[PDB]
Each structure stands twice: as C-alpha cells, then as structure tokens.
C-alpha cells in the first residue's frame, strides 16, 4: 500500500497474510475455516497467518495454519486476470476472537463513490520496493466503470472494478494482492492488478466479489 497509513493494531481482523517462507499475498477470513484470495496468489503449499500486525514480530495474537485445499476459480484466466478469485480451506478451524474475525460477503454490488478500506503488507513505494513490517491501510473510493474502462482500454471485464485515485500518490502494490477491499463492512473486492503503483491515471483493479457469492457458497458447501 503506497501512501496509506499504519492500521491500528488488529483493527482489520479478517486480514490474513499468505506465507510461503515469506509474505507473498493477502487474503480475507470469511469463516472459521475459509479464506478468499486472488487466484494469481495460487501456490501448492501455503501457510495462512491470522491475527498479524507486525509480520516480522511475534506479538502474541498470531494463529498460523496450513492451507488444506486451495481452489482457484475454474475460469481463472492467468492472462487477463479475469476471475481472479481463489478459496483456501484451512487445515483446521481458527479461534475467532477480537484480533481474528471474519468479514461478511457482499449483499450487493457497491455503487461508485462508496469509500472502502484496503489493507496489506504490500510494497509501499511508487518506484522501487519497500516491504513494510506493519499492516497498512488506505481509504479509497470506488470509481465509475467508465473511468475504469478509459484507464485500461480493452482490459476490464464486468468481474473487475476500479478503486483508487486518478491523480496518483496512493494505491495497492505488489504484495497487497489477494487482500481485501471492504466497504461498509462487506468484502467488495479482492486486490488484483493495476499498471505501476500509485501512478496518475492508472487506478487499481479488483475482482468484483459481488459476482461470486454463489460460487463462494457452493464451493464451501461442496468442500
């Protein structure tokens, strides 16, 4: 997260870090046994870390659990990043508490102009790389589809929404991928892709969660 602020500790309780020997993607806890992330974050072995604030320091609220089942959306297109959604079933249920909590699935598609919360341990620079220790937060609005499209001529599907600032300076970056976009307490997007980081005219693109609720439910039920 470029140009965000440090979240208050454990203030984003559904935020998880996907770890493969290092943090590589975020995710969201949607029930005591399941995490939703980006399909582009797939790896054959993943340790899910919940209750984190400082990814490099054991603060006492961490829960570390291995991924049992990792399910990429059957129509994920690694080329367009269309259907960039994946589900992770935890090897075991976590203890839900103050610092480890679930986030609701969306009851509807949020309108353009809604203010959402984006979080992650992703790169904090507009140029070069700086990996933060503490979880970063960013308040940003949902843009109208037409600005989305204009920005990435021919690349936006209806399973994608733009979130951000057309003027630059703030945004999601590498390492924020698969993390949450929460609006009025519901998960509206999954951090997916953008061009550069925090650059003018290049908003962030998110997987539109409101398009997969069914998919999410069925999968969880069948698995």
Binding site for Ca ion (CB under 5 A): 52, 54, 59
Q: Of Ca ion, its own copies, none, which one sits near residue 59, judging by CB under 5 to 8 A according to partner kind?
A: Ca ion
Q: Which of 40, 53, 151, 204 is catalytic?
A: 40
Residue 23 falls in the annotated catalytic set: no
Residue 53 designated active-site:
no
Task: Output the CA–CA distances (angstroms, integers) from residue 133 to 8, 26, 57, 107, 179, in the order listed.
Answer: 13, 14, 8, 33, 16
Q: Looking at 37, 119, 177, 192, which residue is catalytic?
A: 177
CB of 169 to its own copies, least distance (A): 12
Mask: binding to its own copies, 162-201, rule CB under 8 A, as x and -?
-----------xx-------------------xxxxxx--
Known catalytic residue at 133: no
Whole-number minimum distance, CB 74 to its own copies, in Å?
A: 26
Q: Fill in the per-residue mask, 117 to 156: x = in contact with its own copies (CB under 8 A), - = not in contact.
A: ------x-xxxxx---------------------------
| Least distance between Ca ion and beta carbon 17 (Å) | 9
> Which residues are CB-contacts of 180 (< 8 A; sequence separation ≥ 6)?
12, 14, 15, 26, 27, 28, 103, 117, 118, 119, 187, 189, 190, 191
Nearer to Ca ion, 52 or 204 (CB): 52
Q: Say whether 52 counts as a known binding-site residue.
A: yes
From the list its own copies, Ca ion, none, pick the one residue 127 interacts with, judged by a Cβ distance below 5 to 8 Å according to partner type: its own copies
Tell me, by CB under 8 A, how many residues bind its own copies.
Answer: 15
CB of 101 to its own copies, least distance (A): 31
Residue 138 interacts with, from Ca ion, its own copies, none (CB under 5-8 Å by kind):
none
Residue 57 counted as an annotated binding residue: yes
Whether 94 and 146 have beta carbons less than 8 Å apart is answered as: no
- Binding positions for Ca(2+): 52, 54, 57, 62
Residues with catalytic function: 40, 84, 177
- Binding positions: 52, 54, 57, 62
């Amino acid at each position: 997260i470029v140009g965000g602020y440090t979240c208050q500790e454990n203030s984003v309780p559904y935020q998880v870090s996907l770890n493969s020997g290092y943090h590589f993607c975020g995710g969201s806890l949607i029930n005591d046994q399941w995490v939703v992330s980006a399909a582009h974050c797939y790896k054959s072995r993943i340790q899910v870390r919940l209750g984190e604030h400082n990814i490099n320091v054991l603060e006492g609220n961490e829960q570390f659990v291995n991924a049992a089942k990792i399910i990429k959306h059957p129509n994920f297109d690694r080329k367009t990043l269309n259907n960039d959604i994946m589900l992770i079933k935890l090897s075991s249920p976590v203890k839900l508490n103050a610092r480890v909590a679930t986030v609701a699935l969306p009851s509807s598609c949020a309108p353009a102009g809604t203010q959402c919360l984006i979080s992650g341990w992703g790169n904090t620079l507009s140029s070069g790389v700086n990996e933060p220790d503490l979880l970063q937060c960013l308040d940003a609005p949902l843009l109208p589809q037409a600005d989305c499209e204009a920005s990435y001529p021919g690349k936006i599907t209806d399973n994608m929404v733009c979130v951000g600032f057309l003027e630059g300076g703030k945004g999601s970056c590498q390492g924020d991928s698969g993390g949450p976009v929460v609006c009025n307490g519901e998960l509206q997007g999954i951090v997916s892709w953008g061009y550069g980081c925090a650059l003018p005219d290049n908003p962030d693109v998110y997987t539109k969660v409101c398009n997969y609720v069914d998919w999410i439910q069925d999968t969880i039920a069948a698995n």
